Structure formats: structure tokens, C-alpha cells
């Protein structure tokens, strides 16, 4: 659904 | 900026359990998958498994019966456990931080790749 | 055979360009994007590739990516001496695993 790019902080 | 570094016992005997700590600076543990990659002298890569900051796991299924990753995000830090050991586990073992795609189904993080490493170190398994 | 598979080495002159194949499967590359590693022995591998195509910052354009089916390939333009190096493809897996080709080898002919 959603990509998590290098050095993109996530939370889901 | 963000700096990762292993901390490691470098021996460990045939059926005991390898232990591992990975410790993030210039950053920090919270809101991102980490894990290990191993790597046999001579051979090729291996993951291990991956840990979110709120302490979900998801492991590699060749090492399913032998493995598991805890997280402090006090200490921001992330660690691993590998039970009964053999030389076939003598390998550099690398900590990262990943990245891929997250579902928000039954799915959740796939993890596609890594992007910051740590410099590895080597566990032999050994008398 | 490991689940991404790679040539073991590819070799071309200085200045010259090489493409390193990647080949995978609908359980991996089909549904999965590609990151792309570069290793000199005794260092950790470096990303070179992410998400297929994409750059990180620090990597010269001469590197590049793509991925077509369920394969993807590593492209190299202006080959240097310091270009040797073990390169690895990789990506999740169906199998519930990241997966790692078996590495090609890069050499520069001297």
C-alpha cells in the first residue's frame, strides 16, 4: 500500500 | 549521519547460543525496521530477520527454530539470539536498517532492501 | 539454486559498460521492487539501487537500474579500476524473507 523509503521514518 | 555498530562475543562453542547487539547513534531505533545479515566467509548474503521499533518481529524461516530479535529503544539498541550453534553460523554478522514496502494488511512491512549498515563482525564457531 | 539468481562474474575494459542480470520470479521481483548492493571484500556492502531504478545520494549516475518481469538488471557505464567489486541484487520474498542473488563478480581487465 505504502512504500517506506531509505531513511524515511515510519509509523504506523 | 546515523551510525550503526555491532558488539559481539567473536567465539562462541558449537551448540550454545550467539548473542548479538546492534547500537544505532546519530539516530534512532524509532520509526524504522532493523535487522542482520550474515555473511559465511567466502559466500553470499543471508538476512536474518527484521525487528520494528515497537518490538514486532518477522524471521527468515531457515532459521525459524533457532532465532529472535529483541529491541531497547531506550538504549537504542537491537539485539540477537542464536541457539545451538555449528560452524555453518561462522559468518560476518552485519546489523541494517531497512526499508520496502508496508501493507496495511495481513502483509505488513515486506523489507526490500537496506540501506545503512554496520561494519560486521565475525562470530566463529569453535572449541 | 538460491531463489534470485545471478551470473557469477562479468568482466569488460576500463571505460567501457557492463549489465549484470538479476532473474527472479513472480514470488519475488513480479511483486517486489529491487535494491542493488556493491561490495569490496572485508566491508560491509554499500546500496547502489533502491526501489528498481532510484539513486542514493553519493552514487554517480554511471549506475543504474531497471527490472522488467520478474528480472531486473544492473547497468555500469564508464568502467574504473575501483569498480571491482562483488555485486548483489535483492528483494522480499513471497517466502517471507528478503533474498539475496549469489553475487556477480565485476572485474575491469588489466
Known amino acids: 500500500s505504502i512504500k517506506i523509503r531509505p531513511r524515511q521514518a515510519f509509523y504506523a | 549521519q546515523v551510525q550503526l555498530q555491532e558488539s559481539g562475543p567473536g567465539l562462541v562453542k558449537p551448540s550454545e547460543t550467539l548473542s548479538l547487539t546492534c547500537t544505532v547513534s546519530?539516530?534512532?531505533?524509532?520509526?524504522?525496521?532493523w535487522s542482520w545479515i550474515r555473511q559465511p566467509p567466502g559466500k553470499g548474503l543471508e538476512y536474518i530477520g527484521y525487528?520494528?521499533?515497537?518490538?514486532?518481529?518477522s524471521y527468515n524461516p531457515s532459521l525459524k527454530s533457532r532465532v529472535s530479535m529483541s529491541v531497547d529503544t531506550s538504549r537504542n539498541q537491537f539485539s540477537l539470539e542464536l541457539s545451538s550453534v555449528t560452524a555453518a553460523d561462522t559468518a560476518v554478522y552485519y546489523c541494517?536498517?531497512?526499508?520496502?514496502?508496508?501493507?496495511?494488511?495481513?502483509?505488513?512491512?515486506?523489507?526490500?532492501?537496506?540501506?545503512?549498515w554496520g561494519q560486521g563482525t565475525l562470530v566463529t564457531v569453535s572449541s | 539454486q538460491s531463489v534470485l539468481t545471478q551470473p557469477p562474474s562479468v568482466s569488460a575494459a576500463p571505460g567501457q559498460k557492463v549489465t549484470i542480470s538479476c532473474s527472479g520470479s513472480?514470488?519475488?521481483?513480479?511483486?517486489?521492487?529491487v535494491s542493488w548492493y556493491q561490495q569490496h571484500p572485508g566491508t560491509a556492502p554499500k546500496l547502489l539501487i533502491y526501489?528498481?531504478?532510484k539513486r542514493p545520494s553519493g552514487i554517480p549516475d554511471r549506475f543504474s537500474g531497471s527490472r522488467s518481469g520478474t528480472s531486473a538488471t544492473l547497468g555500469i557505464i564508464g568502467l574504473q579500476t575501483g569498480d571491482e567489486a562483488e555485486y548483489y541484487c535483492?528483494?522480499?520474498?513471497?517466502?517471507?524473507?528478503?533474498?539475496f542473488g549469489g553475487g556477480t563478480k565485476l572485474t575491469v581487465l588489466s
Open positions: 541494517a536498517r531497512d526499508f520496502g514496502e508496508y501493507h496495511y494488511d495481513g502483509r505488513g512491512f515486506q523489507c526490500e532492501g537496506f540501506d545503512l
Open positions: 525487528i520494528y521499533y515497537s518490538g514486532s518481529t
Open positions: 526501489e528498481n531504478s
Open positions: 535483492a528483494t522480499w520474498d513471497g517466502s517471507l524473507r528478503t533474498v
Open positions: 546519530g539516530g534512532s531505533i524509532s520509526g524504522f525496521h
Open positions: 513472480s514470488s519475488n521481483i513480479g511483486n517486489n521492487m
